């Protein structure tokens, strides 16, 4: 659904070869109406083991374990969120000790501790404009791919630092360049005003991701 708006919002725009422009105009793409309210600005991919912990950018933590099911702590601290692998939600306190869950509680806290020490923020200097869980995610030899439930999908580049976050709702595409300056463009303005290669690439990378996810 979502995933299938945002493939045709990116081919939309790729088709525009964007960078081809005679002079881009991409400042007049921009739209703080589309600034994301929720990234991803910390991840610890333990799925050897248990699964893959992440932080977002509010300091909420989360992770989707192995066996599906999926743990949100919010940034009090104690109030806790829980997925079932049939999708069913639930709300609790770490406070209230339920054995059951005590095991992944203790996992996500450990992901939290070790994020907090030994990560940066990605997005920490970012101007604000339901919190979502890390629906599914994959890793390719250049990227990790990070798809939100709210639809929201979020492209990593290791080589680089650099980041997209696209949200499908807004239509819209969130850029972190090297210089961890961000941007939040209307795809369909991009069309029309252009923009920079590196973008453009990128956004070329993010559709072929978006055809990954949509086959998986």
């Known amino acids: 659904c979502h995933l299938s708006d945002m493939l045709q919002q990116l081919h939309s725009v790729n088709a525009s070869k964007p960078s081809e422009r005679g002079l881009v105009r991409q400042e ?5 109406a589309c600034i994301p309210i929720f990234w991803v600005s910390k991840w610890v991919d333990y799925s050897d083991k248990y699964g893959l912990g992440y932080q ?3 300091n909420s933590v989360g992770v989707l374990f192995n066996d599906s099911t999926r ?3 919010y940034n009090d601290g104690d ?5 079932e692998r049939d999708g069913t939600e639930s709300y609790l306190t770490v406070s209230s000790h339920p054995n059951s869950l005590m095991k992944k509680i203790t996992l996500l806290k450990y992901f939290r ?4 020490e030994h990560l940066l923020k990605a997005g920490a200097n970012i101007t604000p404009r339901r919190l979502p869980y890390l629906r599914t995610w994959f890793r390719t030899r250049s990227a990790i791919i990070l798809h939100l439930s709210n639809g929201s999908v979020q492209i990593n580049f290791f080589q680089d630092h650099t980041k997209l976050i696209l949200c499908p709702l807004m239509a819209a595409v969130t850029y972190i360049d090297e210089k961890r300056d961000f941007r939040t463009y209307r795809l369909s303005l991009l069309e029309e005003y252009g923009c920079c290669k590196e973008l453009a690439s990128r956004l070329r990378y ?3 991701m ?3 996810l949509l086959s998986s």
């Not at 007049?28 to 703080?32: C, S, T, W």
């Not at 501790?113 to 907090?116: A, I, K, L, R, V």
Request: charged letters at 25%; hydrophobic letters at 40%.
């Open 28 to 32: 007049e793409a921009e739209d703080p």
């Open 56 to 58: 977002l950018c509010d």
């Open 71 to 73: 743990l949100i702590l």
């Open 79 to 83: 109030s806790l969120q829980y997925i």
């Open 113 to 116: 501790n070790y994020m907090s």
């Open 206 to 208: 993010a559709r072929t």
């Open 210 to 212: 978006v055809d990954k």
